[PDB]
């Protein structure tokens, strides 16, 4: 399920019930949610491993953050448009669709760690494991959504039972999902069900093998870079089609990732000539995204709206994002250019 | 038709949902219908250097502006009110304790920018005043029961003609096509529907606007020499828990708000105000016209708590324990009576 560019709005948060829908395995059903209280998680690689409720995790602490929550293949599409020849890239064509900006409600992991005890000495990496039923018989690691992220991220990690203001659905990983502000949208574990402080990674598939950046023709394997960072991107979302001559608000949603969106600068005309946009409405931090905005005042004709942002560490897009075979990450400006017809 | 929003209902993620937000009109609401085309909505512009009507699809080429305000009835905390009546004192109302205001984020045109493009408010000019997309009964005096109020013009930089709200577009329950926002005032003053705004050398006369929502004593009636309901004050309350918790840590939260000001800082007290202890802000700033979420991390022994909160705003304005009454109702602040009681077990 893919949100529209007309039905991102400029609020900066995206109404979670257009935000896009990703599962890599079927869900779980939605029973899980009868009693939301009940809900068992298992934290372990720390002092005093035990089992907690999503009761008692709500003893131990509150944080509300907005994040961006977007599939690494959100751009698929433009990587697809760029094969020759006999070159060929599965999986889902996503545009700019795939991405949203919501606000989250939870306990830090932090809290939870620190109340029993801490992180086990040499824990490298946090791992959380995905609450859906795994299919008897065959090797759970083949299709268990389990993912590593670096113990750096400790201290933003939430456990969230509430988004934008609402208990969790189960179409966004209810009734508790381990949320990794500033990484990948894979990393962003639903109805998570463990949490472990671990020295190495998970060798679950979707994290050994699964979600690498690599050449064309290339397996996916460790060695690789997953898709954990999001890079500095940006999009035109409004208007999505049509104007009329004069003056026309022109608008979009830029971030940085693990980084704050400095600037954007947009394009009428394709990239040949900038100028800077204005941000839009509040700030809501690092890891969630901002609305910027160019008045432009044009005549009849079709133009081709494009956005260039940079973050605070003067990390710019690309016109175009170099090839990986997967089609991760894409976060070129040109691509995703809006066509705009002004009457 | 009200909808008053439970305590358990606003979350702690700042925003509240849209499907929960409270409803309060004054009249019947208009019909559906006037949503099938919100780019054709017209808008009269007056007061103003060249005036005109304009369309939502004309007011969105003007400009955009995003930003959270608390819309809050004004007589959010009536009940509170009411609790304090003796004797032979009555108050007519609806009893709302605290679910008449949510904090929602608003998306349109800044009513600055409309203006600006009209040649700027006409010499004179003294407020903004906005009147209601209700239709209104045919030969009868529209005085009586035209949604029409007045603010003063010192709002311009601030007031938003709004299409969406929360990322969506205005629902009809929120006053869709278009709504005017005047961030840190009372709710009446927010007019649903909007089909004229009017820079204006005095307040409308319509009823809604000289005698009702006026502040008075009890047994007065409304005048127009009396304060309007307009700028909100200082205010919060707790949210969660809301019952019953279990011995041990509990995380006690709320919403608190300055109106025209930030809120800068909150203390909770969980024993009814004798003891008070300060309260750690959670979840980003969205500015001036918006409320924080505020908790407390406690410690509690098996009892019977008092929770209660007490803001103060970035001005050195703190909530009182009781607020003076006033004979309709409006603007309740006060700490104490919005007290939680919670059974720790
Ligand atoms: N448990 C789990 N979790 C999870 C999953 C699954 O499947 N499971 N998926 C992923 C992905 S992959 Mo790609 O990178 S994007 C994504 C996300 C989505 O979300 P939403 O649906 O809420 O939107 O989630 C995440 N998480
Ligand atoms: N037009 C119009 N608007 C309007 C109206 C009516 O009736 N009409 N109401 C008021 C009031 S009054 Mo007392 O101060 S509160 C209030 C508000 C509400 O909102 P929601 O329903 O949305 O919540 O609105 C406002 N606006």
Redesign the interface.
Known sequence: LETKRSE????????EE?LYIKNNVNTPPESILADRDGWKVEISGVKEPRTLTVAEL?????????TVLQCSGNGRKYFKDQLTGDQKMSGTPWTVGAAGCV???GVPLKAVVDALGGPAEGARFITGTGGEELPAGLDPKLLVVERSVPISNLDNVILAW?????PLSLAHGGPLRMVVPGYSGVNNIKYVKAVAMTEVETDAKIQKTSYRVHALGEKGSPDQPSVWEQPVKSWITTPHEA??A????I?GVAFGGMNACKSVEVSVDGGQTWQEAEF??????RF?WR?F?L?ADLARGTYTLVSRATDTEGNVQPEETEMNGAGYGHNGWRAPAVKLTVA
């Open positions: 991102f709005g400029t609020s900066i948060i995206t109404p257009k709500k003893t131990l602490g509150l944080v509300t953050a907005a606000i989250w409600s509430e988004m934008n203001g609402r104007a009329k004069g003056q026309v608000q608008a839009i409405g509040p700030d809501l931090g969630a609305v905005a008045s």
